[PDB]
């Protein structure tokens, strides 16, 4: 509907109207009250806008030996913190603007789970499902090539990652190309990208865990009736019904975590059409049918559903095909009770409106699609410390537990001894587990819902100290605005 | 009026709907006719667009202590023939539609002229005249850092020039700049940028050439009642009269150096009003008012001019103030016979429609704009090899020249001797001036001259080739495309 | 390292655009980077002083390099710093001095009984 | 005997016979059930070459005054993973297949114990006896310059380490002549080698740990009747007699790291001559007359063997000196029930067949000598982290652990105190020396021990999987080719 790149614009706005005047307060100085209102409005006309972007055209040849060229796009936001991340999204509907827009959320989305990354995107005019395997294989290690060559892609200055219509192949692509023309003497090759095969560096749950932290984010505040006594809802998965719009990898991988406790699917919609079955639908089922049909539609368990899935009667709505699904012209008709947007701003500034009447709580995409990022710094990570998590320890730290509960033991049998005999100390059944030490499979899952839970806490507790309610939105951004100002102001905004 | 992009762009098809056949049947193969033709047409598909694009914005503090931000461009055509040109335009009508027409152009007239260089342009939205000289200074040296900081700037990538609103200065700001962050090791730090101070590497007639090469693309075609036969006019510059639009360095350069030759000036029109004055006008007076008043309306010497100076009736009229200045709503008016392209498209496809109806003669831009880019290749050289000119053989080359003459005098008198007595062989005048060899003042007047002739003869050789009477216009983009094609051909059009 | 100047006589729009030139010079010559010198501050400097050497060598070389913000050491917070960055110092003062005052091996010479809540003391500067 | 590159290639074939099968199945796509096995085949005529090799020459002047020249060579084996790594070896029988060789089997090792290197190998005609120590280091140094100047040494590119005949001398030559040509702007200079000096950034069981490897290899064996089953043997190291087919640093520390359990030695030889004493041999006692004589012969309590150590009687037969040494001539008389074999392929194929038909327990160089890597995997890192282990935590971890304690301690009281009083929790003996944290000495010590087990577990497991009784060797390749593989498939195999 309206610029999305200014949507997002009129909504950072929102935020800085707000902490501008805590936010002058804080800045300490000797200026006058209006001079210092002038210097944060100044910095935050500094932070609105990106500050890179480029527009490139290249030369390809297909297999039928006919050239075409193809758009390709690359925006970085900040460089208040480096390395600057986003993903690459094949699509038609690709645009200056868009990509524009998407990198400043990465910028605010890092800030918000505190990960010390700035924001990027990418794009390219292309419909991967008309070209073949060895021809987006010649555009996209051409791609990475003139990146490389004007300085957008490195371990340190740009890391992308994937996005819609992209994988683990395209990043197995652009790692190969990368290390073979200039990393070669570069020792952190691999870093230059994240995404990637388990066999190339990549980490455990690396797609899946978006669907996780969709999952620990709501878990986050279902947990509390602070708000949904609001709702009129009470806690529990075990009694909610969600639906789901579209099926990426968040759409699967959310549906499925989700199924694991209790949290009944009802429907689901493709780009083809929808489907309904109020009994329940069953996720492992539903990848059967996608390897052997490529859609839903004609799925035997569930009933063909005429209409959008927004306009379903449920208790959690999950967009998660693509940003402006949920406008003002159906807003009105939500017809539940949460969203939470995995989806790249999905909804409006109206709709946020009509959402405020109607005391419809709106979980934001940041926070919410913050799985992915931490993951990828943890995958960034790995590819710089050169080594498996704990590996140097698991023998030591194993043990060395082991001869801690004998020297309970053994003191203890030391007083009593006879008493009872001997007191044998053993693990329990976790203990067991858990005991050598964390895998990356364990530090994965544990930081994760860490991060989420710590910083939902930040998030609540603003929202209650200005009394935003169920206008979640505005208070991430408040945090976001203020983490990322304070960088360029003791920062001394400019080095000229 | 229309998108100045496609302007150009709509231009650049009519050569190729023409050269097509010819070009076609020059590409030697074993392909089918018509796969030839989709080659071709391939190739043009991929020349026509600009390869990068940079769009930028810079936080830069004022004197006044207060922050603003400047969006700032530049675009990179083609790749064909390294480096990239085009120069920096400081101006509040840059858009990135302007730079990548512009572009497209220094990459066509470089063609044209033979220079080994590919086309670029760059750009700032902003108004110097709003500034002062410590803030104009700050954002140039914070501009120059961005790009080489993305390899947009260097001897053998990239090399700015000046272009409307600059001059020497900002250039003496740049080359400081790249060569006390980058090119420090680099030997060629100073050919980073042409257009310098004759103290920082620059060349005699920098700016006054580029008017002189108007004038011998000019004098080249007035030479030849071929064409003005056909206007209904007589060869001499003693005999026109000319006009200007706007005073720029070619406004006035090439005023002055017409003036030398008989070429009387009536009119002129800066951005604020035009002045007439029939028995003439003094272009030394000119300069005069304009270092005591800077604008030419109050001058003595000639009356206040009402109406645009596309209304004045002439012989010879000479845009030279911004692109666009003459349109279809105006060209029935010409009132002139010839027309100038000293401003880089102030014309349209319509009026190129008109003019040829009224019979008009219309020099291009392409091979008419081409004598700041020579002299700039001849800075580019004078910096690499770190030498002045001819200074190792001044001395050598002096009495080589009259050992020679020794050796016809002595063999003559040898044969006659008493016959005549003694038979001095000495220099003439101006022969004494050159008797020691070419000095870079030489070199550049000459080549310059050199280069233009040659190259319209190229042009018209071509136009009547195919009968292309006074479209002089679409005569030089087919040698540029036919230039351009060959080196994506042989080169395999990619090296993926 | 050291500089000729008297920093009370010169702004703060002085100071920075010294700083910013001397810390170009350096590494222009190969002493300033994460690996081979590495600055910190000293007496009349600061935390200032070193966000306005890391924002050059990081906008100037740095750019490239994954380690550029350790180059220098003294940052404020926001941009790579320590807790206790300077009342470190201080502290190291004490554990030294708590290292020694405990060991009555030494003040026995002296004819000092161990404690703080004993002692008195002064300060130069 | 045979080319000793096709010795190495034709068992790498055996493995590969085997996996083809399963290989195929694991791989998934659409292809026909041939077309994979075309796949597969062709990835593996890829893996078993060498990708690059360098042969270089030296000119060197002596101490004398007199020039000569020096041949030295360079192979990397596989860039599936980097940094490639192997040692140095000075020798006349230096040669490029036993090179090529060696680089491959570093490779396969590399692989079986899970460290993220490839496989390189060096070599140079020369016998360091001959020359003094200010001409060993004027080659050295020499040597080390072509290769990084041609990019054969780097942190993250390759990495050399000792072998034959050269040691911590070489490696502090090779350390100060990297570091101060190229290394000095790289802050990761000194991870450029291995087997440095602790003063110069090695670690503690730098030489050792080869030894210990060993032994924890055996160790991993021994302690399984389901094999010494078959040998008729019975576990225990007490009960156990070996040799030792010379001192190298693994002969020696292999030696002696048994005798602290009670396996006995009879005989050990040099390349000079064996002696042999049935009551046992001291290796502390030998390093005596090493440091007195240079060699063995004269050793007063042992007796001069007369023939080849090859033809004693013993329970456990370590080959060390030098490959090739037991061949088909002389495996008849093997006199021994296990070989292990320490010296990098000692035997042959043929040697390999009459060991299953005599059921022979060969324990192969893979997994056996992967001790001298890890241990350099571990001196690689701590020169990347840029601190010593632990150091951060040795007082944090001290006393966390004593809090612990007392959080027993004071909540048991709680309940009880009266009852029995005060119940102190202290610690034991040996956890009182692992309270504080692990420290390099006890990383190493552990982190091999466990690396070991690890893999021999994996090995084991495969043997049985495919019935491969005593043919360890085979069992090995064959997880190393299915790791390997897994990396060039799923990269797709090149990014041309
Ligand atoms: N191409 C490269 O340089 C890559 C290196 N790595 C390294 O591996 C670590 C993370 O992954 P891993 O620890 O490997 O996964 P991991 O922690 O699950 O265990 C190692 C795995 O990598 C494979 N692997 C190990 N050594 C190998 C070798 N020499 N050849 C072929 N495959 C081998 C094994 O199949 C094993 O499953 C990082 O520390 C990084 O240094 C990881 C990915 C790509
Ligand atoms: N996949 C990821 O790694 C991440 C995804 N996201 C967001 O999640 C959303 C979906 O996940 P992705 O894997 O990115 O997408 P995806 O690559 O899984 O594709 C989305 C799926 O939804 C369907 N779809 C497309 N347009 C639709 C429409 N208008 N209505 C209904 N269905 C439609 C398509 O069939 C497609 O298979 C995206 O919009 C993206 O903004 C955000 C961060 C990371
Ligand atoms: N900063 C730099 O490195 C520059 C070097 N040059 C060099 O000069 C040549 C072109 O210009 P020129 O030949 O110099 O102009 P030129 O050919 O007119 O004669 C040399 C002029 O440069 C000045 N000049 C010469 N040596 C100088 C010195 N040591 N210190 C200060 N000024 C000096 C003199 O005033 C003289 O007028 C090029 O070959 C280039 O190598 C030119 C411009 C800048
Ligand atoms: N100056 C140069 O080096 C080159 C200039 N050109 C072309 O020549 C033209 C003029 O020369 P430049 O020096 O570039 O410009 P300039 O920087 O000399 O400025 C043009 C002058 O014309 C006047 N003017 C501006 N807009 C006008 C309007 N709409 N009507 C009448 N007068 C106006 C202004 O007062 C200004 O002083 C430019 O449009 C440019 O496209 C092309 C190549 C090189
Ligand atoms: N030349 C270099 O840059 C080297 C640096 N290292 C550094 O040391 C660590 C590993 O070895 P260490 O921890 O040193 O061994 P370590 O862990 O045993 O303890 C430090 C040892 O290094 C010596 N040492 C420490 N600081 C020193 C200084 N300023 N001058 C001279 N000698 C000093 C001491 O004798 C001490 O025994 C690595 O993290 C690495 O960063 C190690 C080897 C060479
Ligand atoms: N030393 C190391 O770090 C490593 C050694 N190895 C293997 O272990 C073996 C021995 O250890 P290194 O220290 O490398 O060798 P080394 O440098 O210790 O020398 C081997 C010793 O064995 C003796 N010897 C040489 N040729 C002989 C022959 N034909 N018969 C009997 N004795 C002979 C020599 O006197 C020499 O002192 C080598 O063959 C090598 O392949 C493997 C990996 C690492």
Redesign the pocket.
Known sequence: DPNFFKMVEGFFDRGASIVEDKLVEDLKTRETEEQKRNRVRSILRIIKPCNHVLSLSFPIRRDDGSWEVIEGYRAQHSQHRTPCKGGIRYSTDVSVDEVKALASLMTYKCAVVDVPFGGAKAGVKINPKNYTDNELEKITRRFTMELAKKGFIGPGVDVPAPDMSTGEREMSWIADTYASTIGHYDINA?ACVTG?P?????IHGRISATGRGVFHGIENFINEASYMSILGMTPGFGDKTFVVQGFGNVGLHSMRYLHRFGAKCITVGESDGSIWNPDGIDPKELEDFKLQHGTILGFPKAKIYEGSILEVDCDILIPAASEKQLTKSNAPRVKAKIIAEGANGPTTPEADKIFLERNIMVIPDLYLNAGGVTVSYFEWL??L????YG?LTFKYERDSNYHLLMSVQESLERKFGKHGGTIPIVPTAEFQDRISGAS?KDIVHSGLAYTMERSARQIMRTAMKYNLGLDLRTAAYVNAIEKVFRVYNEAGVTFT
């Open positions: 691999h990637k388990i066999s190339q560096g990549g790995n590819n410390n050169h080594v498996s590996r990356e």
